Amino acid sequence: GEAPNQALLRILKETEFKKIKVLGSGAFGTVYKGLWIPEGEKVKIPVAIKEKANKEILDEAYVMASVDNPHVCRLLGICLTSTVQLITQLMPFGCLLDYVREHKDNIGSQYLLNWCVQIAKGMNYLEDRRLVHRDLAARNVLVKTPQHVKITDFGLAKLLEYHVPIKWMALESILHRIYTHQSDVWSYGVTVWELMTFGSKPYDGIPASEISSILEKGERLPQPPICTIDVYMIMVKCWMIDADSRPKFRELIIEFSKMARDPQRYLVIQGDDDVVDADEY
Numbered sequence: 001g002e003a004p005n006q007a008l009l010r011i012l013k014e015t016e017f018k019k020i021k022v023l024g025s026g027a028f029g030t031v032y033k034g035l036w037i038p039e040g041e042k043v044k045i046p047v048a049i050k051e052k053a054n055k056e057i058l059d060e061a062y063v064m065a066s067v068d069n070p071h072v073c074r075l076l077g078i079c080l081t082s083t084v085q086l087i088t089q090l091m092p093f094g095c096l097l098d099y100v101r102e103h104k105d106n107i108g109s110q111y112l113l114n115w116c117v118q119i120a121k122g123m124n125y126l127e128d129r130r131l132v133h134r135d136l137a138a139r140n141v142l143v144k145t146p147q148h149v150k151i152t153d154f155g156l157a158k159l160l161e162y163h164v165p166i167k168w169m170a171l172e173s174i175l176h177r178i179y180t181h182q183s184d185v186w187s188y189g190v191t192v193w194e195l196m197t198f199g200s201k202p203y204d205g206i207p208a209s210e211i212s213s214i215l216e217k218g219e220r221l222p223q224p225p226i227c228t229i230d231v232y233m234i235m236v237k238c239w240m241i242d243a244d245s246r247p248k249f250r251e252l253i254i255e256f257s258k259m260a261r262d263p264q265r266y267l268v269i270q271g272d273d274d275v276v277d278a279d280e281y
């Protein structure tokens, strides 16, 4: 027996939001930066506006409407025009992959380990909601402030095993298309590796079709220069063949929290008006 999903889908008036500029474009479509000004209440909310694809943006709106956690992106509503528009919280510092690349010379160990805690909290919450993300990656973690990140992009999420980006996927997902919370743990491991390498590309150069063979042979991603064996062992554990031998998200929270209390012991880095944010509306 499953519980009824009593989330609210808010439908917004087009005249309530002003597109300020284009943040980005691609196959997906066009994402704009804007404000949402609900009629009456004196409030201006910074928002991102994302303009069968309709069925897919609706599937994603369904998922984002059903999650509410400090480390998961919040859905504000949809607007029913020509194409369906997703209206989400504007995350001013962009995705975490671009952020660590753009600020390599300024990311301390405190930030890196705190991001690992926060991402783990967000994923643990998703697991509580019996939700498999299926696309966890540094590109899909947004930065509200350098101190606060949130998991985004639920275009592949599935509400529960469940029967694609190859270099972030567990071996079971590449071979048998099986996805669990524990295959999300594998993707968490690759995401942490991305952050610890300040944005390197996993298996850079290796063709995606070769990835399945490499993993079967026992090879894994290398140990990042800044990583003590303590941190790298955590990543390696996320890449075990036996899915139930990988750590749980609730455990990853615990481990990385301990490390975040003495960060320089685990990461060795050289030189180590009426505007309302959505979290307060």
Ligand SMILES: *CCC(=O)Nc1cc(Nc2nccc(-c3cn(C)c4ccccc34)n2)c(OCC(F)(F)F)nc1N(C)CCN(C)C
Pocket (backbone or CB within 6 Å): 023, 024, 025, 031, 033, 047, 048, 050, 088, 089, 090, 091, 092, 093, 094, 095, 096, 097, 098, 139, 142
């Ligand atoms: C990693 C790519 C990226 O994040 N670019 C980005 C994003 C924001 N803020 C933001 N907030 C909420 C939702 C989104 C978003 C959702 N989807 C599906 C996207 C696709 C492509 C780009 C963005 C999204 N993004 C951001 O905030 C800037 C500001 F607040 F001023 F609007 N800036 C950026 N950029 C442009 C920085 C990264 N570039 C180097 C690509």
